[PDB]
Amino acid sequence: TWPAWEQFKKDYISQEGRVIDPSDARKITTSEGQSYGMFSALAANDRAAFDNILDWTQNNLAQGSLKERLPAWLWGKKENSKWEVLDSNSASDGDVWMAWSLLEAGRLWKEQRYTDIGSALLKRIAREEVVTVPGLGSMLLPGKVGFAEDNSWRFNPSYLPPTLAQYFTRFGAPWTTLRETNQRLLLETAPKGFSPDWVRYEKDKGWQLKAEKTLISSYDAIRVYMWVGMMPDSDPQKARMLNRFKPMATFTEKNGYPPEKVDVATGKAQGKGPVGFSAAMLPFLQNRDAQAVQRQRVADNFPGSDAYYNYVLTLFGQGWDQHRFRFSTKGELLPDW
């Protein structure tokens, strides 16, 4: 039993298996939310929840089958009292977490059905939202449509955790190249030690790292530091990424909290991140004292029932801090069941 996960289910997961953000008047579900629910259910050894969440996802986000289409990213209440897909575009972070969770569920629970669905999903991600970018090679787009145009692409460094990238390499191309190009994305777009929420690449011109509105480390990029922290200590990439992002650790150590927003071009930080940002620091911070300062903030300000975003970050970050799961050197789940 994973008590925070139990309370999460009560607060945020319907009997029909949908993960809900109640802060929104539309009471929305996302493919990302479904995928985190599935990951957490697998981590908890909660097969009933996993199945129910998978069922709702296939029926409501994938018109019956994840084998046939990437899940719609956004679902919720329309103006006419109707509940339905609100945006049919995909969000590839949901897609990859969802594929990984299915493949690992298939392996760990010895159910071929999960493997089959996870495999078909993963292949479709590769077909439909991976593209070859001149100068980079294979890249993972943030979604099926809207992130690529002639000679320009937009990426989200938080979308592919290095542990997942490692895992997928077992499936060959394009995942073998994507592991390396994902490293390039993380390392080359943080000139001042802070990863951007969003970043563009232009053919020949390269990364676009001059100051602009979304080139900041805030609500998306906070996950980058957390994914790096979750890498196994043995992995030599980890050291390299810890070094790159050291200025985030340094700010948090010095100030006693992570910032809300950091200008990626200048390194200038503003504001104080919410409790979920402190949870994200838990795997990332290597200093025992600084980690304990963040641990206290999460413990004393633990997210309630109307704090979906912070609760999601807390499941991952405090979850890791309490050994609720680990990742192997091959990106597999090492469950704590």
From Swiss-Prot:
Coiled-coil residues are: none
The pathway is: Glycan metabolism; bacterial cellulose biosynthesis
GO cellular component terms, A-Z: extracellular region
By its UniProt entry, which Gene3D superfamilies does this protein fall under?
1.50.10.10
Top-level class of the enzyme under EC nomenclature: hydrolase
The protein's name: Endoglucanase
Q: Name the InterPro entries for this protein.
A: 6-hairpin_glycosidase_sf, 6hp_glycosidase-like_sf, Glyco_hydro_8, Glyco_hydro_8_CS
Reactions mediated catalytically: Endohydrolysis of (1->4)-beta-D-glucosidic linkages in cellulose, lichenin and cereal beta-D-glucans
List locations, semicolon-separated.
Secreted
Q: What is its main location?
A: secreted
Q: Where is the active site?
A: E32, D93
- Check the record and name the Pfam families matching this protein: Glyco_hydro_8 (PF01270)
Q: Which GO terms describe its biological process?
A: cellulose catabolic process
| Other notes | The genes bscA, bcsB, bcsZ and bcsC are constitutively transcribed but cellulose synthesis occurs only when DgcC, a putative transmembrane protein regulated by CsgD, is expressed. Cellulose production is abolished in E.coli K12.
Its domain of life reads: Bacteria
